[PDB]
Design a protein around this ligand. Structure first.
Ligand SMILES: CCCCCC
Length: 201
């Protein structure tokens, strides 16, 4: 029916396996209505999940938590870390996840352009600016801007998730609870561990 993220534990040590399982339900929503223009945002999530899963699967106990991934790979790659392995993949994945969070939260808070109430371009632009734009050069920005501008009508977007709109929005707010908390904890980990990088693609 739905797929909520696990509750945050008190130690804030998110388990890798259930994390990957949960967020693996997110790329299909880019398909529930999607031309190839939206593939760039989808791929920031999808391609990066695949990279992390690959590392985790080699040794699930060693990479049991996301914190484990960072500390283990810091030991493994030394001074090349954190621009390496699953650490780098998750550094980008958290930004894709953040895009989704801000985009969905914006919609749920009833944020819109009064001139275009059935568009979601202001919501998508807001999310892009606060999640991803900072790490994007001019070339990649155009690629993403093309996707953001091709966004579907709000009514079609909500319809697709619900295959009322107010009841749909209610369910998104519930999903956003543990989803938002989890992402914030991952951002905070990256800062705490000095794993965050600022280079642009
Ligand atoms: C594209 C994000 C949709 C998330 C479904 C709750």
């Amino acid at each position: 029916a739905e797929h909520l993220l696990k509750p945050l534990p008190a130690d804030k040590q998110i388990e890798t396996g259930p994390f990957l399982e949960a967020v693996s339900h997110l790329p299909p929503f880019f398909d529930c209505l999607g031309s190839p223009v939206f593939t760039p945002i989808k791929a920031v999530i999808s391609g990066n999940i695949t990279k992390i899963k690959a590392v985790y699967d080699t040794n699930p106990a060693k990479f049991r938590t996301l914190q484990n991934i960072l500390e283990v790979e810091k030991e493994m790659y030394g001074a090349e870390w954190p621009k390496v392995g699953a650490t780098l993949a998750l550094m980008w994945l958290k930004r894709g996840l953040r895009f989704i969070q801000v985009f969905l939260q914006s919609i749920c808070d009833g944020e819109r352009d009064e001139n275009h109430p059935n568009l979601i371009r202001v919501n998508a632009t807001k999310a892009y600016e606060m999640a991803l734009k900072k790490y994007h050069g001019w070339i990649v920005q155009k690629i993403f801007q093309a996707a953001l501008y091709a966004a579907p009508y709000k009514s079609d977007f909500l319809k697709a998730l619900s295959k009322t709109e107010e009841e749909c929005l209610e369910k998104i707010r519930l999903f956003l609870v543990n989803y938002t908390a989890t992402i914030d904890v991952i951002y905070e980990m990256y800062t705490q561990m000095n794993a965050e990088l600022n280079y642009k693609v």
